[PDB]
Each structure stands twice: as C-alpha cells, then as structure tokens.
Design a protein around this nucleic acid. Structure first.
Lengths: 247, 63, 60, 141, 228
RNA sequence: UUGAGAGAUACAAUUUGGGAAGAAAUUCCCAGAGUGUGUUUCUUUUGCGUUUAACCUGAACAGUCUCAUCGUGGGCAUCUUGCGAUUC
C-alpha cells in the first residue's frame, strides 16, 4: 500500500535533515488495543527474518561476558577457527566489574556495537554494565547458550563449550531482529537499516515481523501480541512516527 | 426390509453413540495400560525466551 | 516367475486369516487326525541334531 | 516414621483395589472362531456371522444381534459421560502413582532403620554410584 | 439414574451409569457373599468383575454363544469357593438346577454354607475324574463350564461330558498354559487343547484370549455331539 | 552382504461385506483383508575366527581408622541450593 511511500519520504529526509544525519537504524513501533501482560524483563526475545538477512556477524563488534573461571570459555572459542575471527573480546563477569567501572562504561558503549552474554550470568549484568545500555534496545545484552546440554535436578553441571553451535547462534542472532516485551502496548522493533538494503527489503521485513508477532500459535516466543494490532508506525531513532496499517 | 433395518439402526446409533469414547479413545487406553501395568532450565526461567533458533543456513554459511 | 508361483502355493496352503481383530482357523478332517501320527516339531529334533553335530567334536 | 508411611501406603493400596472394583476395563483379546470348510473360510465377515452391524461388532463388552436391536439420561453425555469416565481412570492412576511413590519412600527409611540395629556394617558402592549395605555373616544370638 | 442395558447373552446386564459395570439380577435379596456392590433399580442386582471370575472375562471379551442360558442347567466344573458359582446361579434363575463339583475342603465348607442360602446350586464334593461316583445326581446337564486347573483338562471334560451332557449340547472350558506347559507359547498350548477336544467328539467353536484380566488364560466353547 | 518365515503396516489397486439413500450410476456410516513398492523386529539356514566368559563364594570395607544417626558452622544462587534419599 502506502508503506513504500512512507519509507520513501523517511529515507529522503534522513539524508537531508541536519538533525537526522546520524541515526542509521529504522524502527517500527506497535501500539495495540489491549495491554500485553508480561512486564519488561531484560532478556531480548529474537525473531527470524525468513527471506532477507539483516547483518552478517563479521561487521559488528561483539563483546561476550562469560562465567568467572573463563579459561576454556576463552580458550576454545579463540582457537577453533569457526569463531576465531568472530568475537571481538571475551571478558569474565568478575573481571568486567573490576576493570570497567565509572565513566569507562560510556566508551565501552561507544566502541562496541553489540553485547551478548551467556544465560548463566545475564541476570547479574545490569548492576555491573550500567544504565546507559538500558536506555532502549540498541545495546541491550542478547542471549547465547554455551553447552547445548541441559541440567536436571541435583545433577552436576558438566562444563562444555561447543564453538560451532554458538557461532550458529550468533549467525542466527545477527541475521535478524529482536523484541523486548513490555507492560503497556507500545513496543518497538528495529527492522532494517538505511544503507544495508532498500525499500522492498524493509517492506517484507515489516511483513515477516507482523506475521510472527501476531501468530496465535507458537506461544512462548511468538504469541505476545494478542487480539489485533491497532497500528504500526515506522520511525528512526529521532524522526517522527509515520503511520501505516490504520486498522 | 427398510422399515425393520432402520429401527435396528436407530437402536444401534442410540447405544454406540452413548457407550463409546471418541475423543477419549487415546487417553482412556493409555491410562488403562498404566493402571493394569525448546529447552527448559531448572534454575533460570529465561532460557526459552531469548535463545536464537539455529537453522541450517546458520551452520553452513561461512560468511 | 516361480518365486511368485510358490508364493501362491503358500496362499492356498495357509489355513488361518486374521479378519480384523478376529481370526479364523480352518479345522482339519477327522480321518487324518486319527489314522496319522502327529508331526514332529522343529524345536525338539534340531535341539538333538545340532547337539550331536556340534563343532566341539570334529565330525565330518 | 515407618509406621505412618506404610499406613498412608496401605490406604492408597486399599483404595486402589477398591478403585479397581467399580472401574471397567475393556478387553481386546484374540477372539478366534474356528471354521469347518474353506468356502466358509474366505466368505467370512463378522457382520455376516454375528448378523449385526459393523459398529456393533467391534465393541467387545456387548455385541447385540440385529434381532436384539429391535441414551442421554446422564445429560449431554457427549462431553459429560466420557470425561467423567476418564476421571475415574485418572483417580486410580493418582492412586497408583501415590502408592508406588510411598513404596519407594518407605523402603528408603526401612533400609535406614535396619542400618541402626547391630552387626558389622559394610558400605559397598556400585560403579554407577548406587550405594548399599552388605553385612557380616554373624549369627545374632 | 443408571442407564441399563441387557447383554447379547440373556440374563446378564451392563449398568451404564457415570461409571460402567457388568451386573446380574439377584436371586437372594440383601445378601452379598464376598463383598460385592449392587444397584437397586424395583429389582435388586449384583455386580461381576472379571478379575476373579474366569467366566466373566469370557463374557466381557465377547462370547458368541454362551451356552449358560437363563433357563438351562449348568455343570460348574471346579467350583472354587462359590466366587462365581453364585454368579451363574443369578444368571440361570430358579428354572434349571446348576451343578457344582469340587475336591478341596476349604471351598467345600464355603460351598455348602452358601448353597444353604441358594436353592439353585447343588454342590458335589467328589472327584470330577469319576463321573460314576456322582452318577446318582445328574442326567444331561444342558451345558458344562470347566474351570479346573489339573493338567488333564481334556480328559476331565471327556469323562464327564460323555455321559452327563445333552446331545447337541455346549461345552465350555477354562484352560491356562501355566498349568499345563508353562514353557512354550500360549497359542500352541491352546492349539494342542483344541485337537485334544476334537478327539472327544467335541467341535470347538470359539477360543478367546483373556488378556486384560488373567494373563496366559483362555476360554474354549464348542458343541458336543452324539453320545450320552 | 545370505535361505525363508512371522507383523505393526507409509503410499497407491479394484474390490469383499452389513446399513442408508443412490429409479440410471454414484456416494456415505464403516468393518477389514488381499497385492506391489516400502520400511521392517524376531526365528532358524549359512561360513570363518575364538574355549574362554559372566556372576557368586571362602577369614575380602577399617591407624591415612571406617561406617551409621542427630545437631552445629561455612561454601556452591555466576546454581549438585539440595527428594522423610546424598549438595560439598
């Protein structure tokens, strides 16, 4: 419909408006009628993009926060040659708290373009990594598994790090976008980029996003928006919310 | 013979519909055999929301 | 084509079909039951045969 | 502690066999009918032999003849009767899973209670890690 | 409340309430003889459950021609303490006298004390391999059902049924493979037993596997022709 | 990697059969079976190499003294967070 026209005027002004010269990410926001009941945690649920990959993982600075011993977490992923040219720097959580503290979290925010941590110590993160990261979802810390094996009740944790399968996760997590569920209706997803691709690529990125978010089946990662979407609004991080899908 | 056979079919549909288990044909047979004889973490409840669905292209594309 | 021919021979020589859950066995004649001794079965004679012809004694 | 656990266990055991008393278990055996001729062997159909309909044949708890073929007092029984019949099976299953849980619970302190009495104890250890206790061969007077 | 339904076999019913049971009309009102439940719906009834009655598993598995009939005489071979002899008294009514035989003394005291209450059953306490030893009592019983567990089941039928049975009569026998062989397949045991009955002028009609109640058991029914 | 036997059967082939409507063919409630390609579990036929295995037992846990059982104290929430069971 007019979604191509709305993206056309947004692309035209963002290289022309002096205020919008710096924001390079494109967001669609979703306001629903009912409020989805799950409050805002800090684990970002990711969604796939079935046709067009967003980013390949060899153009983003990737910081990994691992467990406290961190010997074979560092050793295996650096000397496997599946992930050797992938990770930028690996830090243990106790060493991250001790080394990077104060105003150095700002330069850690600016220099490193994406942050991901294991499921072990991700909940401990926001009191050592700072409130600058939790201003929206630009550098919200993403999710990776480490072992591809589970822990039952009273079973000893067997430590294993398979680099191929955690490389495939970073392939599966940089190729697409993610949503963070919220208490109120307004949630925003970052679909596409200004110069990575163009308007027909963003248009089917919109369609695959609203297909996954409105899926009445596939509950725990997809069944978040219930009923129907009232509207969707395409925007940059500093532009206005241009309207599409009025009803 | 249509008059007598319809009355037999009427009594047959009266019993067979009211003395069966259509949707319970599986559960009442599995429980009768027991009577006669997405990864989930234990301690972190945020395992299944945030994990990336690994596809075959993510295991193959060396790029 | 003779592999299909003795397959058909096994079809008419069979005497037990399983009609659904139910099964039907053919009953043999009374004169064959009384005037003929019963068949030996393979489990009782081959147990004796390969015990006598076991490889622990160098037969043959 | 051992007396209480077996008392709950024998309560669930007695309610199990009382729960098996009024329950119905459908039979599916090898019901086989002998025949005397090959011409009746291959023309056999159970609807022909039992002279009744096909849906009447497959039920084994009763199989009424077409002469005997000549409902909803438990009202809306399409959802009420089958669910409530399933709930009696569910309660017997909850009787059984509580009973075998109480059996494993009782055995774990009964080995502990016999561990305290007398004799020369010796703790053996299985290669899988399952511990036990083997005793000396001393005749207690 | 309970929806009632007569069986294919006459004289035995199925009580289809919220729970389901197999049930028989009482003959002795207000008296259960081993602790069994009942439904009064009027006529007072009595329940069966196949886990101790080997005839009841034959009923519930589906028997084509139950020769036990509501007006026919029944020879109960192997009366194990009246646990099912009282049940076949309820299904044949006061019309034909049902005969029960047994050897042991513990069922014998239970049989006589329960046949005091029930005039349908007459108990015999003599060996079932010697039908001449109680020849003073029976003449052509209308059917015989066997539940013996002594390894001459075919002979103990052929001894009794050759001179105590009506011509073109029905013979029922419970046979289990754990009694007789207990080391081969069950189906070959029952295949041995039907040719055993075929030599005794009995044409075997139906054999049924009693699988959900009595493991390794069976019920054979059939016709008996042209002697006695 | 063989010789057959016995099935759950995944797709198709007109059927076999009870009931209903099919004036003329259909087609439904169904109940199965048979056939080929599957896919198969197990029984024996089969040849070579190997006569040793597996389990239990005798006075066979214990001076680095061990094992119970009740308590106490501290670790592991970046998780053996602990069952009338044994987290160390």
């Amino acid at each position: 419909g007019l979604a191509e026209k709305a993206l056309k005027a947004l692309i035209l002004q963002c290289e022309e408006n002096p205020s919008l010269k710096n924001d390079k990410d494109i967001h669609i926001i979703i306001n629903t009628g009912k409020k989805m009941g799950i409050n805002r945690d800090n684990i970002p649920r990711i969604i796939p993009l079935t046709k067009y990959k967003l980013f390949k993982p060899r153009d983003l600075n990737i910081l990994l926060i691992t467990k406290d011993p961190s010997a074979l977490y560092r050793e295996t992923l650096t000397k496997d040659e599946h992930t050797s040219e992938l990770f930028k720097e690996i830090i243990s959580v106790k060493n991250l708290r001790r080394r990077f503290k104060g105003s150095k979290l700002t330069q850690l925010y600016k220099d490193f373009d994406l942050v991901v941590a294991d499921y072990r110590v991700h909940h401990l993160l926001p009191e050592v990594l700072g409130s600058r990261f939790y201003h929206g979802s630009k550098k919200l810390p993403y999710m990776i598994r480490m072992s591809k094996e589970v822990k039952l009740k009273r079973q000893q944790m067997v430590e294993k790090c398979d680099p191929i399968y955690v490389r495939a996760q970073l392939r599966s997590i940089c190729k697409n976008t993610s949503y963070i569920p919220n208490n109120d209706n307004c949630l925003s997803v970052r679909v596409g980029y200004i110069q990575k691709h163009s308007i027909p690529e963003i248009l089917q990125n919109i369609q695959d996003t609203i297909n996954f978010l409105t899926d009445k089946s596939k509950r725990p990662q997809g069944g978040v928006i219930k009923g129907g979407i009232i509207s969707i609004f395409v925007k940059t991080s500093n532009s206005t919310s241009l309207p599409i899908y009025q009803f | 013979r249509k008059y007598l056979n319809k009355l037999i079919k009427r009594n047959s549909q009266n019993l067979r519909s009211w003395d069966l288990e259509e949707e319970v044909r599986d559960e009442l047979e599995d429980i009768q055999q027991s009577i006669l004889k997405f990864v989930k973490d234990h301690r972190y409840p945020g395992l299944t929301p945030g994990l990336a669905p690994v596809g075959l292209s993510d295991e193959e594309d060396s790029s | 084509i003779k592999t299909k021919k003795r397959k058909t021979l096994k079809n008419l020589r069979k005497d037990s079909v399983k009609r659904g859950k139910f099964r039907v066995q053919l009953l043999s004649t009374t004169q064959d039951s009384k005037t003929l001794p019963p068949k030996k079965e393979s489990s009782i004679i081959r147990s004796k045969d390969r015990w006598l012809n076991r490889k622990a004694l160098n037969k043959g | 502690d051992s007396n209480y656990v077996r008392t709950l266990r024998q309560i669930e055991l007695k309610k199990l066999e009382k729960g098996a008393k009024q329950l119905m278990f459908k039979s599916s055996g090898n019901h086989t009918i002998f025949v005397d001729s090959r011409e009746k062997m291959n023309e056999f159909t159970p609807e022909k032999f039992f002279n009744t309909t096909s849906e009447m044949v497959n039920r084994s708890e009763n199989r009424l003849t077409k002469d005997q073929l000549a409902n909803a007092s438990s009202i809306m029984p399409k959802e009420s009767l089958d669910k409530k019949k399933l709930k009696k099976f569910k309660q017997v299953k909850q009787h059984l899973q509580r009973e075998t849980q109480l059996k494993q619970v009782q055995q774990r302190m009964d080995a502990q209670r016999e561990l305290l009495k007398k004799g020369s104890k010796k703790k053996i250890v299985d290669s899988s890690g399952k511990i036990s206790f083997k005793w000396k061969k001393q005749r207690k007077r | 409340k309970v929806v009632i339904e007569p069986h294919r076999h006459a004289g035995v019913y199925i009580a289809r309430g919220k729970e389901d049971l197999l049930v028989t009309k009482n003959m002795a009102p207000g008296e259960s003889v081993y602790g069994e439940k009942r439904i009064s719906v009027k006529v007072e009834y009595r329940v069966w459950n196949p886990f101790r009655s080997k005839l009841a598993a034959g009923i519930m598995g589906g028997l084509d021609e139950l020769f036990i009939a509501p007006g026919k005489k029944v020879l109960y071979l192997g009366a194990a303490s009246g646990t099912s002899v009282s049940h076949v008294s309820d299904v044949v009514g006061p019309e034909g006298v049902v005969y029960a035989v047994e050897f042991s003394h513990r069922p014998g005291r239970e049989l006589i004390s329960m046949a005091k209450k029930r005039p349908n059953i007459i108990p015999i306490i003599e060996d079932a391999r010697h039908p001449q030893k109680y020849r003073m009592l029976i003449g052509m019983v209308d059917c015989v059902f066997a539940d013996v567990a002594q390894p001459d089941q075919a002979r103990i039928i052929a001894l009794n049924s050759h001179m105590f049975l009506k011509d073109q009569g029905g013979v029922v026998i419970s046979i289990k493979a754990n009694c007789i062989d207990s080391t081969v397949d069950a189906e070959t045991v029952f295949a041995r037993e039907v040719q055993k009955l075929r030599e005794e002028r009995i044409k075997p009609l139906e054999q049924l596997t009693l699988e959900p109640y009595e493991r390794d058991h069976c019920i054979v029914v059939g016709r008996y022709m042209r002697s006695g």
